[PDB]
Symmetry: C2
Subunit: 170 residues, 2 copies
Amino acid sequence: METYPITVGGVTRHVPLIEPLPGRRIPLVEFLGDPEFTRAAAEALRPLVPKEAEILFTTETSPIPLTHVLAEALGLPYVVARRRRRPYMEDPIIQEVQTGEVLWLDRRFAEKLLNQRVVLVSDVVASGETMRAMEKMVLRAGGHVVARLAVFRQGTPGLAVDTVAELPVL
Amino acid sequence: ETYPITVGGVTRHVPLIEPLPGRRIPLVEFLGDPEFTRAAAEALRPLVPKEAEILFTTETSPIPLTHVLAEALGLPYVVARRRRRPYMEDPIIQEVQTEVLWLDRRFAEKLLNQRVVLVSDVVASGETMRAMEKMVLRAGGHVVARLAVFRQGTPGLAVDTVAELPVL
Ligand SMILES: [Cl-]
Ligand SMILES: [Cl-]
């Protein structure tokens, strides 16, 4: 069982590898279930958050604990876009991720982005398409992105995003 | 238009949803709310057996609740999903009498020989948790407690809660 060592803010994790494309493997980054690794990552991103930031924006599911911890550390709230419509979801902003994934933001969350300086947060950024979709949702709700952050950078994103580590493709 | 629920002194005026005809209930949501989640976590904390070694919850809203509680107690936790996800490793699959739960093999191995505590935001019939308890058994773990912040009616399962959700 092959593992690859990834490190963030002093905390190291030997993680399995996944092959999203033939012969192109990447370490599996998972913050879910891991408070210590999540804390290290949230603390590494914290200094990258603009002092003007008013709310965080992330997508389910793995990024949730990371964003929650960062938000509480910053004393800010945050919102979560879902990857599918959920029962009782209210008049959601639906945004297609340019291929396909579709993001859903409950109206209750959207109302919280109005006139707010938003910071997009993800665990990993690759092409940047997910964040482009997230930003459009921000604009549609009446606010705007003052910063885009992700813990890991995979390859070279087609969008400007601040990251703290590189995720190697093996 | 909104109904007020309180936990640990933190009050939230939440919307109402109708899980059944003419029966509305407060919509408790911890996602996006660190303060409310913190109050709920500290409220659940005293209900956690001292033998507990790992927490077990299901996506999605209970995740931040469980994460905060876990970090406070210095424990790890695992999360069951409500649908198979890409690259999922030989998962434990369990059906709910009411939904199918999926537990990644990497998470199941964390439960082996461990004392487990089930955590949720809201408990009603108690089925989701029964499904979760079976997954723990198959993972070779043992449940020592079942916790939820809110109780909705009377559960057909023994679950410790902090407050009740009225049926309006
Ligand atoms: Cl995910
Ligand atoms: Cl949910």
